[PDB]
Amino acid sequence: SMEQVAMELRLTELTRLLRSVLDQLQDKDPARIFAQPVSLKEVPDYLDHIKHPMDFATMRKRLEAQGYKNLHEFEEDFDLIIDNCMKYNARDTVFYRAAVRLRDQGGVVLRQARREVDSIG
């Protein structure tokens, strides 16, 4: 149908905008702490602690399959990255601190993203 195509074009354009958001958030992680999944070879107990691991490469795979239907879904995954880290790592660690700084800096980007998603529809 033509309606199905129009819906698909909307999803494609959301995917465009989420890719730009993802790039901007990942620049706020210059140490690349959140770039890849926590290695289960190197942290063998991780899944005992963290039930839904997340990282920027995993988000990018979902994004490129157009697997985010709305900004809420994308933010859910970003918040997992931060929240998983702040639970597994203690306050005094470079990991925890990196997450706090990513959260704080990403907030600004996500605030305007929400306006753009609503604005463009």
Tab-separated table of N, CA and C in Angstrom:
chain	number	residue	atom	x	y	z
A	1	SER	N	0.815	-1.222	0.000
A	1	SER	CA	0.000	0.000	0.000
A	1	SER	C	0.834	1.251	0.000
A	2	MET	N	0.226	2.343	-0.426
A	2	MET	CA	0.895	3.581	-0.342
A	2	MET	C	1.073	4.008	1.129
A	3	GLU	N	0.107	3.679	1.994
A	3	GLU	CA	0.196	4.055	3.432
A	3	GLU	C	1.475	3.351	4.065
A	4	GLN	N	1.661	2.078	3.712
A	4	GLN	CA	2.806	1.284	4.230
A	4	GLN	C	4.095	1.907	3.813
A	5	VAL	N	4.191	2.363	2.571
A	5	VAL	CA	5.363	3.115	2.095
A	5	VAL	C	5.636	4.411	2.861
A	6	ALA	N	4.546	5.151	3.141
A	6	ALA	CA	4.664	6.465	3.843
A	6	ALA	C	5.194	6.229	5.265
A	7	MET	N	4.663	5.176	5.893
A	7	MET	CA	5.094	4.744	7.241
A	7	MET	C	6.563	4.348	7.202
A	8	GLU	N	6.930	3.591	6.170
A	8	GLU	CA	8.335	3.228	5.998
A	8	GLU	C	9.274	4.403	5.749
A	9	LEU	N	8.803	5.427	5.052
A	9	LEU	CA	9.610	6.619	4.836
A	9	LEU	C	9.835	7.378	6.184
A	10	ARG	N	8.787	7.471	6.984
A	10	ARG	CA	8.811	8.076	8.367
A	10	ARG	C	9.851	7.314	9.203
A	11	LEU	N	9.803	5.990	9.183
A	11	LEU	CA	10.782	5.148	9.943
A	11	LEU	C	12.201	5.388	9.454
A	12	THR	N	12.391	5.494	8.141
A	12	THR	CA	13.672	5.783	7.592
A	12	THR	C	14.192	7.111	8.011
A	13	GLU	N	13.323	8.114	8.030
A	13	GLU	CA	13.763	9.423	8.443
A	13	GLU	C	14.053	9.464	9.989
A	14	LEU	N	13.293	8.725	10.745
A	14	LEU	CA	13.602	8.641	12.222
A	14	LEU	C	14.981	8.020	12.398
A	15	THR	N	15.251	6.978	11.584
A	15	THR	CA	16.510	6.269	11.628
A	15	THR	C	17.627	7.206	11.294
A	16	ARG	N	17.440	8.093	10.276
A	16	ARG	CA	18.411	9.154	9.968
A	16	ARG	C	18.696	10.035	11.152
A	17	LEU	N	17.650	10.457	11.822
A	17	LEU	CA	17.813	11.410	12.922
A	17	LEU	C	18.476	10.690	14.130
A	18	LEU	N	18.009	9.483	14.447
A	18	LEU	CA	18.667	8.639	15.514
A	18	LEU	C	20.118	8.321	15.213
A	19	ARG	N	20.513	8.185	13.939
A	19	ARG	CA	21.928	7.975	13.657
A	19	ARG	C	22.754	9.189	14.023
A	20	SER	N	22.278	10.389	13.698
A	20	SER	CA	22.924	11.608	14.081
A	20	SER	C	22.966	11.728	15.646
A	21	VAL	N	21.833	11.456	16.300
A	21	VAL	CA	21.832	11.427	17.790
A	21	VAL	C	22.889	10.440	18.333
A	22	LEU	N	22.945	9.239	17.783
A	22	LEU	CA	23.879	8.220	18.272
A	22	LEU	C	25.303	8.709	18.130
A	23	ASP	N	25.589	9.412	17.019
A	23	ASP	CA	26.948	9.887	16.797
A	23	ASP	C	27.340	10.928	17.777
A	24	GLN	N	26.421	11.826	18.057
A	24	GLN	CA	26.620	12.884	18.998
A	24	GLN	C	26.798	12.318	20.423
A	25	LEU	N	26.006	11.318	20.795
A	25	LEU	CA	26.173	10.718	22.153
A	25	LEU	C	27.497	9.991	22.280
A	26	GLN	N	27.883	9.252	21.258
A	26	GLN	CA	29.079	8.507	21.322
A	26	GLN	C	30.323	9.421	21.353
A	27	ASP	N	30.225	10.623	20.792
A	27	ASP	CA	31.335	11.575	20.944
A	27	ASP	C	31.550	12.018	22.367
A	28	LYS	N	30.511	11.939	23.192
A	28	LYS	CA	30.619	12.190	24.609
A	28	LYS	C	31.269	11.060	25.415
A	29	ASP	N	31.776	10.061	24.698
A	29	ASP	CA	32.502	8.893	25.286
A	29	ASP	C	33.818	8.769	24.589
A	30	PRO	N	34.697	9.776	24.803
A	30	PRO	CA	35.934	9.706	23.985
A	30	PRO	C	36.900	8.599	24.394
A	31	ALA	N	36.756	8.104	25.634
A	31	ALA	CA	37.546	6.953	26.079
A	31	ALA	C	37.072	5.585	25.482
A	32	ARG	N	35.926	5.586	24.785
A	32	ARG	CA	35.361	4.368	24.191
A	32	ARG	C	35.010	3.286	25.204
A	33	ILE	N	34.664	3.736	26.412
A	33	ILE	CA	34.291	2.823	27.474
A	33	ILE	C	32.999	2.066	27.135
A	34	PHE	N	32.150	2.723	26.345
A	34	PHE	CA	30.801	2.160	26.083
A	34	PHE	C	30.635	1.680	24.637
A	35	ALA	N	31.733	1.650	23.893
A	35	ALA	CA	31.699	1.292	22.524
A	35	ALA	C	31.300	-0.104	22.164
A	36	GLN	N	31.662	-1.079	23.026
A	36	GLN	CA	31.441	-2.472	22.705
A	36	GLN	C	30.785	-3.203	23.916
A	37	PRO	N	30.196	-4.374	23.677
A	37	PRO	CA	29.718	-5.162	24.835
A	37	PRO	C	30.743	-5.502	25.829
A	38	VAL	N	30.394	-5.440	27.085
A	38	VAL	CA	31.256	-5.999	28.147
A	38	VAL	C	31.578	-7.460	27.751
A	39	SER	N	32.881	-7.757	27.672
A	39	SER	CA	33.374	-9.106	27.347
A	39	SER	C	33.097	-10.191	28.450
A	40	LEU	N	32.383	-11.264	28.125
A	40	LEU	CA	32.072	-12.282	29.075
A	40	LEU	C	33.257	-13.177	29.235
A	41	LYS	N	34.214	-13.122	28.292
A	41	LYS	CA	35.513	-13.784	28.567
A	41	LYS	C	36.250	-13.076	29.667
A	42	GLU	N	36.341	-11.740	29.629
A	42	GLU	CA	37.011	-10.922	30.669
A	42	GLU	C	36.247	-10.572	32.004
A	43	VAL	N	34.908	-10.588	31.935
A	43	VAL	CA	34.039	-10.405	33.099
A	43	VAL	C	33.017	-11.559	33.110
A	44	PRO	N	33.482	-12.800	33.471
A	44	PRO	CA	32.638	-13.988	33.339
A	44	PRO	C	31.379	-13.994	34.193
A	45	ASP	N	31.358	-13.265	35.293
A	45	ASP	CA	30.155	-13.155	36.142
A	45	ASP	C	29.180	-12.046	35.673
A	46	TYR	N	29.445	-11.372	34.545
A	46	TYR	CA	28.694	-10.102	34.296
A	46	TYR	C	27.144	-10.320	34.305
A	47	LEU	N	26.685	-11.391	33.678
A	47	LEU	CA	25.253	-11.610	33.513
A	47	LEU	C	24.565	-12.018	34.817
A	48	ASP	N	25.350	-12.376	35.840
A	48	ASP	CA	24.811	-12.535	37.162
A	48	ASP	C	24.395	-11.194	37.772
A	49	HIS	N	25.044	-10.127	37.322
A	49	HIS	CA	24.850	-8.775	37.842
A	49	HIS	C	23.878	-7.999	36.953
A	50	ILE	N	24.098	-8.019	35.666
A	50	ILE	CA	23.416	-7.156	34.700
A	50	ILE	C	22.573	-8.051	33.762
A	51	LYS	N	21.264	-7.861	33.876
A	51	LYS	CA	20.374	-8.719	33.101
A	51	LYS	C	20.147	-8.337	31.655
A	52	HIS	N	20.307	-7.035	31.313
A	52	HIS	CA	20.106	-6.567	29.966
A	52	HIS	C	21.355	-5.669	29.586
A	53	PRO	N	22.468	-6.332	29.253
A	53	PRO	CA	23.652	-5.578	28.789
A	53	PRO	C	23.357	-4.715	27.557
A	54	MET	N	24.079	-3.590	27.435
A	54	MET	CA	23.885	-2.740	26.282
A	54	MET	C	25.192	-1.997	26.018
A	55	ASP	N	25.346	-1.527	24.810
A	55	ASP	CA	26.568	-0.790	24.418
A	55	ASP	C	26.312	-0.104	23.051
A	56	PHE	N	27.190	0.799	22.636
A	56	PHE	CA	26.915	1.538	21.442
A	56	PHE	C	26.939	0.700	20.156
A	57	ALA	N	27.784	-0.327	20.068
A	57	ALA	CA	27.766	-1.165	18.857
A	57	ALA	C	26.477	-1.936	18.690
A	58	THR	N	25.943	-2.420	19.808
A	58	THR	CA	24.696	-3.157	19.815
A	58	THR	C	23.581	-2.191	19.390
A	59	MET	N	23.595	-0.951	19.870
A	59	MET	CA	22.567	0.017	19.469
A	59	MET	C	22.622	0.297	17.957
A	60	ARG	N	23.838	0.390	17.442
A	60	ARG	CA	24.047	0.707	16.048
A	60	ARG	C	23.504	-0.429	15.175
A	61	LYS	N	23.705	-1.667	15.601
A	61	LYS	CA	23.154	-2.836	14.865
A	61	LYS	C	21.611	-2.733	14.804
A	62	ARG	N	20.994	-2.475	15.943
A	62	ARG	CA	19.532	-2.277	15.957
A	62	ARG	C	19.095	-1.090	15.107
A	63	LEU	N	19.813	-0.012	15.181
A	63	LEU	CA	19.451	1.180	14.442
A	63	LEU	C	19.454	0.901	12.931
A	64	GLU	N	20.513	0.257	12.466
A	64	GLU	CA	20.666	0.005	11.018
A	64	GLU	C	19.726	-1.037	10.455
A	65	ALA	N	19.146	-1.880	11.289
A	65	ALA	CA	18.059	-2.693	10.914
A	65	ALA	C	16.722	-1.947	11.040
A	66	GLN	N	16.747	-0.608	11.183
A	66	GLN	CA	15.523	0.162	11.556
A	66	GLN	C	14.686	-0.434	12.685
A	67	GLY	N	15.363	-0.879	13.768
A	67	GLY	CA	14.743	-1.518	14.850
A	67	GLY	C	14.275	-0.615	16.005
A	68	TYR	N	14.486	0.703	15.885
A	68	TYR	CA	13.898	1.663	16.840
A	68	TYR	C	12.616	2.324	16.201
A	69	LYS	N	11.473	2.017	16.761
A	69	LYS	CA	10.181	2.582	16.213
A	69	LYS	C	9.921	4.019	16.617
A	70	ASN	N	10.521	4.462	17.723
A	70	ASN	CA	10.280	5.790	18.301
A	70	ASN	C	11.527	6.146	19.153
A	71	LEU	N	11.647	7.407	19.508
A	71	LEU	CA	12.779	7.864	20.321
A	71	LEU	C	12.793	7.205	21.695
A	72	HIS	N	11.645	6.957	22.297
A	72	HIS	CA	11.571	6.283	23.617
A	72	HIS	C	12.371	4.961	23.644
A	73	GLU	N	12.184	4.134	22.621
A	73	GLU	CA	12.930	2.846	22.495
A	73	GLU	C	14.472	3.053	22.473
A	74	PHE	N	14.927	4.058	21.737
A	74	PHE	CA	16.315	4.415	21.592
A	74	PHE	C	16.826	4.912	22.950
A	75	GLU	N	16.092	5.809	23.565
A	75	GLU	CA	16.507	6.272	24.920
A	75	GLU	C	16.574	5.173	25.947
A	76	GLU	N	15.660	4.204	25.882
A	76	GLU	CA	15.694	3.048	26.778
A	76	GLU	C	17.075	2.345	26.744
A	77	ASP	N	17.556	2.102	25.526
A	77	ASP	CA	18.831	1.433	25.291
A	77	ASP	C	19.963	2.344	25.790
A	78	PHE	N	19.919	3.652	25.488
A	78	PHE	CA	20.973	4.540	26.037
A	78	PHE	C	21.006	4.544	27.570
A	79	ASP	N	19.858	4.592	28.176
A	79	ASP	CA	19.808	4.579	29.619
A	79	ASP	C	20.354	3.246	30.170
A	80	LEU	N	20.184	2.125	29.473
A	80	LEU	CA	20.758	0.860	29.900
A	80	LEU	C	22.270	0.913	29.965
A	81	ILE	N	22.836	1.534	28.945
A	81	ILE	CA	24.315	1.668	28.948
A	81	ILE	C	24.790	2.315	30.241
A	82	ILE	N	24.167	3.446	30.610
A	82	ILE	CA	24.554	4.237	31.770
A	82	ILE	C	24.234	3.498	33.054
A	83	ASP	N	22.976	3.050	33.140
A	83	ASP	CA	22.508	2.463	34.384
A	83	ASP	C	23.214	1.146	34.728
A	84	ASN	N	23.532	0.337	33.740
A	84	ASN	CA	24.241	-0.956	33.916
A	84	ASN	C	25.622	-0.624	34.535
A	85	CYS	N	26.289	0.369	33.935
A	85	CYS	CA	27.630	0.751	34.405
A	85	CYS	C	27.635	1.262	35.811
A	86	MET	N	26.635	2.088	36.171
A	86	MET	CA	26.580	2.704	37.497
A	86	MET	C	26.216	1.670	38.571
A	87	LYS	N	25.663	0.536	38.169
A	87	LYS	CA	25.403	-0.525	39.153
A	87	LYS	C	26.644	-1.444	39.289
A	88	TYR	N	27.228	-1.877	38.190
A	88	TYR	CA	28.349	-2.837	38.244
A	88	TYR	C	29.607	-2.253	38.814
A	89	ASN	N	29.830	-0.966	38.510
A	89	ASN	CA	31.064	-0.302	38.947
A	89	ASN	C	30.832	0.615	40.109
A	90	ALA	N	31.774	0.755	41.033
A	90	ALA	CA	31.639	1.655	42.158
A	90	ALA	C	31.834	3.084	41.790
A	91	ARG	N	31.324	3.955	42.627
A	91	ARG	CA	31.478	5.407	42.455
A	91	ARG	C	32.858	5.955	42.178
A	92	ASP	N	33.887	5.357	42.771
A	92	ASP	CA	35.254	5.813	42.667
A	92	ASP	C	36.021	5.304	41.413
A	93	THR	N	35.314	4.831	40.402
A	93	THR	CA	35.973	4.207	39.288
A	93	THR	C	35.862	5.084	38.065
A	94	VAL	N	36.821	4.920	37.141
A	94	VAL	CA	36.765	5.657	35.885
A	94	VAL	C	35.533	5.272	35.079
A	95	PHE	N	35.082	4.014	35.217
A	95	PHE	CA	33.884	3.561	34.532
A	95	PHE	C	32.645	4.291	34.968
A	96	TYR	N	32.404	4.297	36.272
A	96	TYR	CA	31.212	4.996	36.822
A	96	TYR	C	31.235	6.452	36.406
A	97	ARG	N	32.408	7.072	36.586
A	97	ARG	CA	32.527	8.501	36.320
A	97	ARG	C	32.269	8.795	34.850
A	98	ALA	N	32.717	7.899	33.991
A	98	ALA	CA	32.478	8.054	32.538
A	98	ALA	C	30.970	8.042	32.246
A	99	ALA	N	30.271	7.127	32.909
A	99	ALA	CA	28.830	7.065	32.745
A	99	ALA	C	28.131	8.328	33.199
A	100	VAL	N	28.531	8.883	34.362
A	100	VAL	CA	27.899	10.090	34.830
A	100	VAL	C	28.064	11.216	33.786
A	101	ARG	N	29.282	11.351	33.268
A	101	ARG	CA	29.594	12.405	32.305
A	101	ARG	C	28.847	12.223	30.973
A	102	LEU	N	28.711	10.973	30.570
A	102	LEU	CA	27.887	10.628	29.375
A	102	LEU	C	26.428	10.942	29.564
A	103	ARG	N	25.861	10.613	30.728
A	103	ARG	CA	24.499	10.932	31.049
A	103	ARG	C	24.268	12.471	31.005
A	104	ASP	N	25.152	13.191	31.643
A	104	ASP	CA	24.983	14.632	31.785
A	104	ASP	C	25.073	15.337	30.452
A	105	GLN	N	26.076	14.952	29.680
A	105	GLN	CA	26.288	15.517	28.364
A	105	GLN	C	25.265	15.059	27.362
A	106	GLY	N	24.791	13.832	27.474
A	106	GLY	CA	23.831	13.298	26.503
A	106	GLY	C	22.458	13.905	26.664
A	107	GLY	N	22.137	14.324	27.892
A	107	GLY	CA	20.832	14.934	28.241
A	107	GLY	C	20.490	16.089	27.336
A	108	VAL	N	21.499	16.914	27.056
A	108	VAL	CA	21.375	18.108	26.213
A	108	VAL	C	20.952	17.720	24.767
A	109	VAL	N	21.610	16.691	24.250
A	109	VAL	CA	21.415	16.174	22.892
A	109	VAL	C	20.011	15.573	22.810
A	110	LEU	N	19.664	14.794	23.829
A	110	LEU	CA	18.354	14.128	23.821
A	110	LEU	C	17.169	15.084	23.994
A	111	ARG	N	17.389	16.156	24.746
A	111	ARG	CA	16.363	17.182	24.892
A	111	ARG	C	15.958	17.790	23.545
A	112	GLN	N	16.933	18.097	22.666
A	112	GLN	CA	16.609	18.706	21.391
A	112	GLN	C	16.123	17.643	20.387
A	113	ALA	N	16.632	16.416	20.494
A	113	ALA	CA	16.132	15.328	19.706
A	113	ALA	C	14.655	15.115	19.884
A	114	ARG	N	14.170	15.180	21.107
A	114	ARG	CA	12.758	15.018	21.385
A	114	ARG	C	11.929	16.127	20.735
A	115	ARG	N	12.411	17.348	20.838
A	115	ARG	CA	11.749	18.468	20.167
A	115	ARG	C	11.664	18.217	18.649
A	116	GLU	N	12.760	17.751	18.017
A	116	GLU	CA	12.817	17.488	16.558
A	116	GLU	C	11.916	16.340	16.109
A	117	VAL	N	11.891	15.277	16.898
A	117	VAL	CA	11.004	14.174	16.596
A	117	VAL	C	9.539	14.607	16.618
A	118	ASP	N	9.121	15.299	17.670
A	118	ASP	CA	7.774	15.928	17.771
A	118	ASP	C	7.514	16.970	16.659
A	119	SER	N	8.475	17.868	16.469
A	119	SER	CA	8.365	18.935	15.462
A	119	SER	C	8.140	18.360	14.039
A	120	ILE	N	9.127	17.628	13.492
A	120	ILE	CA	8.998	16.958	12.163
A	120	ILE	C	7.915	15.860	12.129
A	121	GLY	N	7.492	15.360	13.295
A	121	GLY	CA	6.489	14.289	13.400
A	121	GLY	C	7.148	12.942	13.176
